Amino acid sequence: PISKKRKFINDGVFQAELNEFLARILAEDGYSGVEVRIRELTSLVQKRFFLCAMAQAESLRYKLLKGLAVRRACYGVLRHIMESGAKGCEVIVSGKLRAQRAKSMKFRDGYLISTGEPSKRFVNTATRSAQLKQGVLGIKVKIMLPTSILPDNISVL
């Protein structure tokens, strides 16, 4: 017997844990999922228990690990996003990056709403920290998805 409040929190915690586990495991995957080769994963979960932004971020991280010219990679990513039908994007990469000191680099394409509950709704955001030569490079990707309609527009027929 466990109370409702207690249960809910516990469930949330479990969800979080699962997510983290997935992140740890699947560096080679276009990960989003969270709905329940894979046999091992299932076993692990049992033991424990008794277009998208995250994927893009992961891809970026992988690219960084591989060792590209950075800017080019970012551009490619942006292009991909555009192809996948995004109204707007934004990527940031801050960290060490070539020089020792500082250096945050923005990469926007289409328009990116930041403030309001629309932002909360109509953007998928993701954050990965790609470990590299002499520290960490800091990805953050932010995608504005196709709307189910924005509050700013007033479409007269």
- Residues forming contacts to other proteins in the complex (CB under 8 A) are 4-10, 12-13, 15-17, 19-21, 24-25, 35, 39-40, 43-44, 47-48, 50, 149, 151-157
Which is nearer to other proteins, 49 or 108 (by Cβ)?
49
Q: Provide the total of helices (H) and of strands (E) in the chain, helices listed first.
A: 5, 4
Task: Please list, in sequence order, all residues whose beta carbon lies within 8 angstroms of the beta carbon of residue 145, skipping any fewer than 6 positions away.
Answer: 86, 87, 122, 123, 124
Judged by beta carbon distances under 5 to 8 A according to partner kind, the member of other proteins, RNA, none in contact with residue 66 is none
* Contacting residues toward RNA, per CB under 7 A: 1-6, 90, 92, 94-96, 100-102, 104, 106, 111-120, 127, 129, 131, 134-140, 151-152
For the CB of residue 2, give the shortest distance to RNA in the complex, in Å: 5
Which of 35/152 has CB closer to RNA? 152
CA angle 70, 76, 77 (to 5 degrees): 90
DSSP bridge partners of 139: 93, 128
Q: How far is the CB of 12 from other proteins (least distance, A)?
A: 3
Which residues is 132 bridged to in the sheet?
A: 135
Give the one entry of other proteins, RNA, none that residue 135 binds, where binding means its C-beta sits below a cut-off of 5 to 8 angstroms depending on kind: RNA
DSSP assignment, residue 105? E
Q: Which is nearer to other proteins, 44 or 105 (CB)?
A: 44
* Token pair belonging to 95: 């960290």
User: Measured from the CB of residue 64, what is the shortest distance to RNA in angstroms?
Assistant: 12
Q: Least Å distance between CB 156 and other proteins?
A: 4
> What is the CA 47 to chain-centroid distance, rounded?
28
**Angle separating helix axes 39-49 and 4-25, nearest 10 degrees:** 150
